[PDB]
Each structure stands twice: as C-alpha cells, then as structure tokens.
C-alpha cells in the first residue's frame, strides 16, 4: 500500500469497537450465570474479528464442543454484530431506460453477508481454535444483534439470548445424536385433559428475544386442562385479483378482494425449552384453526372508539362500485352490518402465506422451507419435510398426498424487509404498512395506490428497483424514522398441504375444543 | 491557578503512560506546558516536542495545542489573534532554553486549538486521536524539511496495474473532525482505488481502498440572465484514514478531486427536495420570494416533479458554479492553508506563489508552467468575508454554524424585504468597518437560529481562479488518472436548447 510507503511514526484508529464490548459483557454474563448454576460451563464463547479474516461483519460464535460416537463433532451458533460506524460498500445494479442507463445503489443487509464463504471461514477458525480439525461443523441458526441496542443497558435480554443460543446448540447437537422424536401420542394420557385453543386479538405488537417488534394481530395458542404449548402470531392482508376489477369496468351478465393470512411468529411456548421440528409443525397446525367462525376477520371489525387510520375499513369504499370513504364510525357500526359488508366485499375463504426469515430466531428451520420451494436442493428438502411430518404423526402421512405430485409451497418471488418505526411511545413493526393502510392513507387517488401495489409486486421490474420504491413509499408514510434490520421472503402454502396436514393430525389424535 | 492547563497536562500524561505499551507509536517525543502564569502571555498551551538533528543542527519541532478557558478574562480576541507573533516567539524561547539544546529552529507543524467547551474527564479516545495525529504531523513535517522523495502520480499504481475511481455522496449528518467539532458538509466526493482482479477472496470486505475525500456544500450568491449564481465552498479537505501521512501532494490531489462535481450538475443535488421531510431552511422554493411573483413554489406537492425542478434551475440559477474555499488559520491544515492565505496577497505573496507553483509541479512533473503560469494572473482572491466557525445545538445534536446560508435566511425570514438584503450586507459590504458587520452577523445568527450557539474560531473565505482549477484538472488528466463516474441526473422533451445559437441577426439591407 501507500501507508507503509512513508513509514510514519503514528497509528490511528483500530477498526473494531463493538466487538470488544460485546465480548466483555458476554463473558461477564456467562460467568454470572455459571456462578449460580444456571448453565453448564462445558460450552465456550469465542470472538471473530472482522479485520483478521477478511470478512464483512464480525460475528461471535457459541460452541458446545461435545464429541459423538468416538468422532469429533462441533455445533456452532453465530451471532452477528452490525456496526453503524463501519459502512461496507453498497451494491450497484444497472437499469436501462429508453436509450439511457442508470445505476441504482442498494444497501447490503445482514442476510447477504452470511455467505457460504463466511460459514467456511468461521468453521475453519473454530476448528483451529478448538484444536479438532477433523470435527464436523453444524449451525443452529445465525441471529443478528440489532444496532439500536446499547450494550451497557441490555442485561436481561442479552442473558436470555445467550440462554436460548446455548439451548439451540444443545438441541441441534442432540438432533444429530438422534433422540426419540416427540409424537402426539406422548401428549395424550390417562387424564382427559384435552387440549384447547383461546385465539385472542392484539393491538400492541409482540416482542422478540432482543426487543425487535413484530406485527401480530391474531394469535392462536394451545393449552392443557398454567401450561401452554404453542403460540402462532399472524395478521391479515388483502389482495386484489385481476378478474374482479375487470368485472367492475367491463361487467358481464365472487368479490373484489381476497383475504390473505401472513404467519409471522411460529415460536413455541415460553415455558417449554426444547425446539424441535415436531414442535414447529405442531405449532403450525394451529395456523389453520383461526378460520373457525371466520375469526381471522376479527381485526377488520371496527375498533372500540379508536380511529386508527391505518386500519379503517372505509378504504374499501375507495375501491368499489360506490365512492368515497365509508362512514363506518357512525351509529351504524354494528357487528351485523359489518358481517354483511364482509360477506359482499371479500371472499369467505383465505389464503395462507409466511414471511420466512433467513436470519430469524428459527432461521435454521426457515431455511428448510426456502429450499423446499425451489433451488437446486429441492427434492431432498421435500423428503426431509415429509419424513419429519411422518415422524411427528407416526402413521401413513404419504396416503393423504404425495409430495412429488404437488408442491409444498410456492416462492412467489417477493421480498419483505423487516424494520421498526417510532410513533407516540411504543414502537411498532415496519410490516404495518400493508395494503389496506396504504389505501386509507392515499384516501383515493387510484394511481397512487396502484403504483404502491406494483412497487410491492411487479414481475417486470428489477428487484432492486422494487425494493428502492418500497423503501421510498415506506419513508413517505408513517413518518421518516423507519429503521431496517433484515430481509424476508414471503411464500404461500398450497391449500392441499394444510388441508391434509390438519386432517392427518385429526386422524392421528386431535383432542382440541374451541368456542366462538 | 489555571486548572484547565493542569488537568490537560495530567490527562495527556496519562494517555502517554497508557500509550507507551508499544501497541502503538514510539517513544520519541515530549510534552511541555506553557501556561499563562510563567510568561507574559495570554492563552495557555500544551505543546509537543520532537528533536531531529539531520546534518547536525538539531531542529526542534512543535505543534502548539491552544487551551482556551471558560473561567478567565479573554484577553473579543479569538484563538487566531492571540497566536499572531508574540505567542510563537515566547514558545520558541521556551522550547529553546528549557529543552537543553539552545540554538535550534522551529517548524510549527500545524497548530491546533482544542475547543474550550469540551470536558476532558470523559473524552479519552478523542484526546488519544488528537495526540496520535499531532505526533504524526510533527514527524511528517520533518519528513518534508529534511530532503525526501515527494508523492507522485506514479505512486498511485503502487508498482502494479491498479485503477482509480471517484464517487459523490449526498449526506445529512455533518462530518466531524478529530475533536467533537462538526463541519457542515452535504456533498462528499470520495476517490478510491477499484480492484479489477475479479473480486475474489473478499466478499463484501471494505479492505482499505479509500484514497481521499473532500467535503463541501453549496452557497447561493446574488448579482445586481439568471440572477442567482451558484457557489461551492470547499470545507473539509482531509484525506482518508487509511493513509497516515499528510503531504502537500495529498492536498492537491484532494483539490483536483473537488472539481469533479460540475459533471452531471452534482452540486445541484442538495437543492433537490427529498420526499417525506419538511425540515425547512433548506427548501428550493425560497427563490420564489425573489422572482417576479411573490410566492413560494409548492415544493413538497405532487406537481413538483423532477422535470419541473430541472426547469426551476435553468430558469433561475446560472448553470456554472464558481469555486470558493474556507481557509482556516487555526485548522487541521493550518500549516498548509497559510501558503494559500499568503498567496491571496501580501508582503510574501510572490514567495507564496513561487513555492505553491513548485509544490504543485512536484506532483506530476509535466511542466505546470506551460498549462498555467503564476506571474500572468493570481491563483485565488479573498472575498473579504470573515466567516467564522461555531457550533449550535438542536434536536439533541450539534451542528456547524455554516448551516445558515443565504437560502436558509430566505426561508427563515420569508418573503419580507429589507431584512434578507440586510443579512446579505451584514455578510459583506465595502462601505463599513468589518467589526460592525461581524456584530450584525452574530446578532442575525442569534435571531434566526437558537441562541444556544457558541463560537469557536475564525476562518477566511476565498475564491479560486476560474481557469486555474481547469488547468489543474487538465494537468491531472494529461499526467494520467483514469477516473470513472456514473449516475448523474420527468423525461418529457423540453425545447431544443441548441437552436438559439444561430440567429443570423441583421438583414442584407440591399440598396
């Protein structure tokens, strides 16, 4: 280089600030926890400087270091530490318009940093540090640390994150060890303590293990008889089919909207500690129950005296045979008239989809879902998912349908970015923009709403341009204080998949009763 | 008595003790305390000493660290005025006798005044950065006054086939120098090398490729065509953190980089409204108050699109930007800005021109005399402005006092007359003593923005010669610097823009 050309008698800056603080606080928390017998000291925490290995983001790893069957095996869980001080170079793409060309520069998320080369470098680093070059390396699901967090004032959440990380490492190591899978037959016993569902509606968002908010309008949960089993949090979105609008301009001698349910959080119970595929599917089975009594339409019911311009059903007036916002806030806000309005505005059957996260708290399990919907490793993922479902059920799940005949889920080629925004006192998830809220904010102006919808969905537009337009529209609404954390891909389950999974669970034993 | 000097000495000795761990730098310097009590002198100081005896005759080098105080009488003298002539003479005597080696020279390696408002108890890393940069500059100046190979264009290649590139970034958060003082900067031009080896074994790794960055903003002056004339004021000229040596060639490379903004009208980008923000005092609509109609254009509305904006510019501001620069007498590059300040005109103007010509020619070796001489015309002219560096706090952060330009004053004071022109006159007038206009400018600064503003130092604005920068760029191009651009500035057709060239005015008038 040129710094060594002159050999000046001075060294400025270090190039690493947050990693040292994180290592110190993590060592302090580990020592405090092991002092009072909270965690076994068998596991170790390491450090991975970004400069010393030519990597984008410095991420510290958690390792268990337990062998198996006489051969060495290592299980590692990453923990990325993005830093605002260091800004890695952006990504440039070229778009041709007319005769001219333009360059769009887009920021680099945390998902794109965790490349295969990064995994290989971390694997070789941990192999060299732990002195077992022949060990087998597995991952329990990398999880970023949000940059807004302050290290000196995050005791409880950091301790909980460490505990969950070591639990996940132990769980993946045990799964490689091949324990006994938990079938539904274990739940049922001599006592007639049948399971139950207490679906509930929420307004304030749920919180991650760190503090990142995630939007959740309806939650479905499983109880015994004190004891909880599952909790699936998800909200409702509306989409417009091209044929419905066609039957509005050019009529002919259905409904103008379709209802979509987006699963966001699929975590198991707080009380339970282990995390296994059978837990994941037993929890996901509850994501279909919300359709009982059309309960998924509960958020669309008018709020108790609260305007909430991001959830006004009057936007349906802007897109209908009639015009103007519907004055639902009058004395005619009764639940019955809302019932006929829903009967004649949206179809009575929903569609299920999930914003699968490549770097969520269950990113290891979401990765299987992404591979099951496309890419080179597709058939093997289908075999794994079907065999996991069979192990859960214990019966002939292949009879209900064949994986090779119909796809498990479709990719749909959409990207949803996760973030948070500040309003009033409590922050909310970025994913509150939706389409109904955008239509309410636009208060008409067909062109603006159609442009926003195209910005979210356009097969003929470059993905980077679509992301930039979505970011611009996000900044336009709900203020200009949005902060982005990660990226997720939205994929829709096939109807037959759930329609057979719930039936198979019922055949194999489903002792749940709900009232609505 | 002077607790500030004592605490500064103690904290810097503690940093020295924690820095001799061999983890950085080397033990070759010393720290001296020149307080007001010892000598008949004003401000106190904490100076550095580094002794080198090339060809015998040891030459002691210093970089005074002025120590302003907020608990004693000021003598409204500023940091620049106190260090005029007697401060340096007393400091030279102090370093000559007490060091134990009488009969030495001094170089004044870029004196830097620390802000008085900062408390030193909880500012460890800023002071460590200041100390390391001070020692680095002190050694660097000795790398100049000894006889050494200067930086060249061929050094950019680094004995290999490496290519350079430049880019322009628009920011909102002001840049920060070594100390916590902020500098107004919304256009940063960064020049860095680009690896063309296939981009392998480093995915999304920044490495260290930044050569140098220049930070500048845009000011709108007025004339008695388009009335408003654009102006670009270069504020920060510091090079990238990867390099640790500050040499004249880096400075001239940065100045050459700073010109690469008129391409694509990049200086007009900060004037572009951004959707979703109504922060005011930066909107372009203020020019409407000075147009034929007395109204503000609905800038944030949907009717104001990119094509309409590109109209407002051709209709309103002349499309050629003049280049200004704020020379700092007590800044980061003070030892280098003194050359241009002297070349502005004075007793040493000819010597300054000769040495600056020699310095710029010792960069490419292509004969700068041919492209542009020095006796023919001056290089830069002072505009008479006494603009000064301060700090003002709002929204839970600090910002630089330069944020109040002409456009900001127009936005803040609305379409009213006799007060915007009053502000412009207080900024500069020939027919009045500059002290009164400086007081008026301070009053206006207290008026429009918050009264919590504090003042740190004094600078001097100057304007570069229009064709000198062009000659410099032509030199850099012919010497050989492959610099690549991109982007640059709805698209419905608006006039030919070329048919007006041929008017064939005047008929034949045949008898």
The token pair that represents B436 in the structure block: 């009164």
Query: Distances in Å between the alpha carbon of B42 and those of B12, B90, B355?
Result: 21, 11, 33
- Per the CB < 8 A criterion, the answer to whether A135 and A129 are in contact is no
CB atoms within 10 A of CB A477: 18
Chain A contacts of B492, Cβ < 8 Å?
none
Task: Please tell me the distance from the alpha carbon of residue B190 to that of residue B170, in angstroms, as a whole number.
Answer: 11
Alpha carbon A484 to its chain's center: 14
Q: Which secondary structure element, helix H or strand E, spans residue A201, and what is its range?
A: strand A200-201
Query: Distances in Å between the alpha carbon of B265 and those of B230, B268, B317, B486, B489?
Result: 11, 6, 12, 12, 7
Alpha carbon B103 to its chain's center: 36
Phi-psi region of A499 (alpha: psi -120 to 50; beta: other; left: phi over 0): alpha
- Per the CB < 8 A criterion, the answer to whether B382 and B485 are in contact is no
Tell me the pairing of strands A258-265 and B163-170.
Answer: unpaired
- Per the CB < 8 A criterion, the answer to whether B187 and B270 are in contact is yes
Provide the sign of the torsion angle of the four alpha carbons A193, A197, A202, A206, taken in this order. positive
Task: Please tell me the distance from the alpha carbon of residue A435 to that of residue A449, in angstroms, as a whole number.
Answer: 8
Mutate to test the interface with B, among A1, A4, A10 (most CBs of B within 10 A): A10
Chain A contacts of B129, Cβ < 8 Å?
12-13
**How many angstroms away from the CA of A476 is the closest CA of chain B?**
5
The token pair that represents A79 in the structure block: 């923990």
- Per the CB < 8 A criterion, the answer to whether A136 and A72 are in contact is yes
Chain A contacts of B155, Cβ < 8 Å?
2, 5
**How many angstroms away from the CA of A512 is the closest CA of chain B?**
49
Chain A contacts of B241, Cβ < 8 Å?
12-13
Query: Distances in Å between the alpha carbon of B461 and those of A115, B12, B380?
Result: 50, 34, 10
Chain B contacts of A8, Cβ < 8 Å?
136, 139-140, 143, 244-245
At A224 the three-state DSSP class reads coil
B243 vs A2, A56, A86: nearest CB: A2
Chain B residue with minimum CA distance to A482: B276
Distance separating the N- and C-terminal Cα atoms of chain A: 72
Chain B contacts of A479, Cβ < 8 Å?
276
The breaks in chain A (C to N more than 2.5 Å) occur after 225, 253
Going by C-alpha positions, the residue among B421, B434, B442, B423 that lies closest to residue B460 is B434
**Dihedral through CA B347, CA B348, CA B353, CA B354, nearest 10?**
130
**Dihedral through CA B344, CA B349, CA B355, CA B360, nearest 10?**
30
Judge: B206–A88 Cβ closer than 8 Å, yes or no. yes
Task: Please tell me the distance from the alpha carbon of residue B6 to that of residue B19, in angstroms, as a whole number.
Answer: 20
**Residues paired with A96 in a beta bridge:** A101
Chain B contacts of A475, Cβ < 8 Å?
275-276
**How many angstroms away from the CA of B278 is the closest CA of chain A?**
10
Distance separating the N- and C-terminal Cα atoms of chain B: 97
Task: Please tell me the distance from the alpha carbon of residue A347 to that of residue B320, in angstroms, as a whole number.
Answer: 61
Listed in order, strand segments (DSSP E) in B11-111 are 30-34, 44-52, 59-61, 65-67
**How many angstroms away from the CA of B250 is the closest CA of chain A?**
12
Task: Please tell me the distance from the alpha carbon of residue B66 to that of residue B81, in angstroms, as a whole number.
Answer: 12
The token pair that represents B195 in the structure block: 């690896």
Structural determination approach: cryo-EM
**Residues paired with A480 in a beta bridge:** none
- All residues at 6 or more sequence positions from A306 whose CB lies less than 8 Å from its CB, including other chains: none
Judge: B158–A2 Cβ closer than 8 Å, yes or no. yes
Cα three-residue angle B194-B133-B402, rounded to 5 degrees: 80
Chain A residue with minimum CA distance to B154: A2
Task: Please tell me the distance from the alpha carbon of residue A433 to that of residue A262, in angstroms, as a whole number.
Answer: 13
- Greatest Cα pair distance, chain B, in angstroms, is 98
Phi-psi region of A509 (alpha: psi -120 to 50; beta: other; left: phi over 0): left
Chain A residue with minimum CA distance to B150: A6
SS3 per-residue string spanning B228-261: EEEEEEEEECCECCCCCCCCHHHHHHHHHHHCCC
A12 vs B129, B207, B275: nearest CB: B129
Chain A contacts of B275, Cβ < 8 Å?
472, 475-476
- Per the CB < 8 A criterion, the answer to whether A357 and A488 are in contact is yes
Task: Please tell me the distance from the alpha carbon of residue B155 to that of residue A1, in angstroms, as a whole number.
Answer: 10
The tokens 């070329």 sit on which residue? Answer: B498
Q: What are phi and psi of A333, to 5 degrees?
A: -90, 20
Chain A contacts of B132, Cβ < 8 Å?
10-12
The DSSP string of A386-413 is: HHHHHHHH-S-GGGT--TTTS-SEE-TT
- Per the CB < 8 A criterion, the answer to whether A369 and A354 are in contact is yes
Alpha carbon B128 to its chain's center: 23
User: b/e per residue, A335-372, with b = 16+ CB within 10 A?
Assistant: eeebeeebeebbbeebebbbbbbbbbbbbbbbbbbbbb
Chain B residue with minimum CA distance to A13: B129
At B476 the three-state DSSP class reads helix
Task: Please tell me the distance from the alpha carbon of residue A72 to that of residue B63, in angstroms, as a whole number.
Answer: 60
Judge: B204–A56 Cβ closer than 8 Å, yes or no. yes
The token pair that represents A123 in the structure block: 């694997």
Judge: B25–A10 Cβ closer than 8 Å, yes or no. yes
Judge: B244–A103 Cβ closer than 8 Å, yes or no. no
- All residues at 6 or more sequence positions from A446 whose CB lies less than 8 Å from its CB, including other chains: none
SS3 per-residue string spanning A282-334: HHHHHHHHHHHHHHHHHHHCCCCCCCCCCCCCCHHHHCCCCCCCCCCCCCCCC
Cα three-residue angle B319-B322-B323, rounded to 5 degrees: 140
CB atoms within 10 A of CB A234: 24
- For chain B, which residues lie within 8 Å of any Cβ of chain A, measuring from their own Cβ? 24-26, 28, 129, 132-133, 135-136, 139-140, 143, 155, 158, 201-208, 241-245, 247, 275-277, 486-487, 491
Going by C-alpha positions, the residue among A29, A56, A272, A100 that lies closest to residue A171 is A272
**Residues paired with A486 in a beta bridge:** A418
């Amino acid at each position: 280089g040129i710094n060594s050309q002159f050999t000046r008698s001075g060294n400025v800056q270090g190039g690493d600030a947050r990693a040292s603080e994180a290592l110190t606080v993590f060592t302090r928390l580990k020592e405090q926890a092991v002092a009072q017998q909270d965690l076994a000291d068998d596991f170790s925490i390491l450090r991975f400087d970004r400069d010393q290995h030519q990597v984008g983001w410095s991420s510290l790893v958690i390792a268990k270091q337990i062998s198996l069957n006489g051969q060495p095996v290592i299980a590692v869980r990453p923990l990325i530490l993005p830093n605002n001080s260091i800004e890695l170079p952006k990504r440039k793409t070229n778009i041709v318009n007319g005769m001219q060309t333009d360059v769009i520069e887009s920021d680099i998320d945390v998902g794109t940093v965790f490349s295969a080369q990064y995994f290989n470098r971390l694997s070789t680093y941990v192999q060299n540090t732990l002195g077992k070059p022949g060990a087998k390396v597995v991952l329990a699901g990398p999880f970023p640390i949000p940059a807004d967090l302050v290290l000196k004032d995050s005791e409880l959440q950091l301790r909980n994150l460490l505990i969950k990380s070591v639990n996940a490492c132990d769980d993946i190591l045990a799964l490689h060890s091949g324990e006994r899978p938990f079938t539904i037959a274990g739940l049922k016993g001599q006592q007639g303590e049948t399971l139950a569902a207490k679906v509930d509606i929420r307004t304030q968002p749920l919180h991650d293990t760190v503090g990142n908010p995630i939007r959740a309008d309806i939650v479905v949960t499983t109880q015994r008889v004190d004891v909880k089993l599952n909790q699936v949090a998800m909200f409702t979105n509306l989409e417009r089919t091209p044929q419905a609008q066609a039957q509005t301009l050019f009529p002919n001698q259905p409904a103008p909207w379709v209802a979509s349910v987006v699963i966001t959080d699929v975590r198991n119970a707080d009380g339970i500690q282990a995390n296994t595929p059978e837990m994941y599917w037993f929890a996901l089975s509850n994501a279909f129950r919300s359709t009982h009594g059309h309960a998924w339409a509960r958020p669309f019911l008018p709020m108790t005296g609260v305007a909430k311009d991001m959830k006004d059903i009057g936007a349906l007036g802007w897109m209908s045979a009639l015009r103007n916002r519907i004055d639902t806030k009058a004395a005619n806000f009764d639940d019955a008239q809302f019932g006929q309005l829903m009967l004649s505005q949206v179809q009575p059957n929903p569609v299920f989809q999930i914003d699968l996260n490549r770097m969520g708290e269950t990113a290891q399990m979401d990765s299987l879902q992404l591979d099951a919907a496309g890419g080179p490793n597709a058939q093997k993922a289908a075999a794994t998912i079907i065999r996991q479902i069979n192990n859960l059920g214990g019966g002939g799940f292949e009879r209900f349908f064949d994986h090779t005949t119909q796809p498990i889920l479709e990719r749909t080629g959409q990207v949803i970015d996760l973030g948070n925004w500040f309003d009033g006192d409590e922050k909310r998830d970025r994913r509150d923009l939706d389409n109904l809220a955008a239509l309410n904010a636009a208060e008409g102006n067909e062109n603006e709403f159609w442009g926003f919808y195209g910005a979210q969905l356009n097969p003929n537009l470059h993905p980077d341009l679509r992301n930039r337009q979505s970011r611009n529209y996000d900044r336009q609404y709900l203020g200009s204080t949005v902060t982005y954390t990660g990226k997720a891909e939205r994929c829709t389950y096939n109807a037959k998949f759930i329609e057979a999974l719930d039936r198979y669970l019922a055949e194999a034993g489903l002792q749940i009763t709900m009232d609505n």
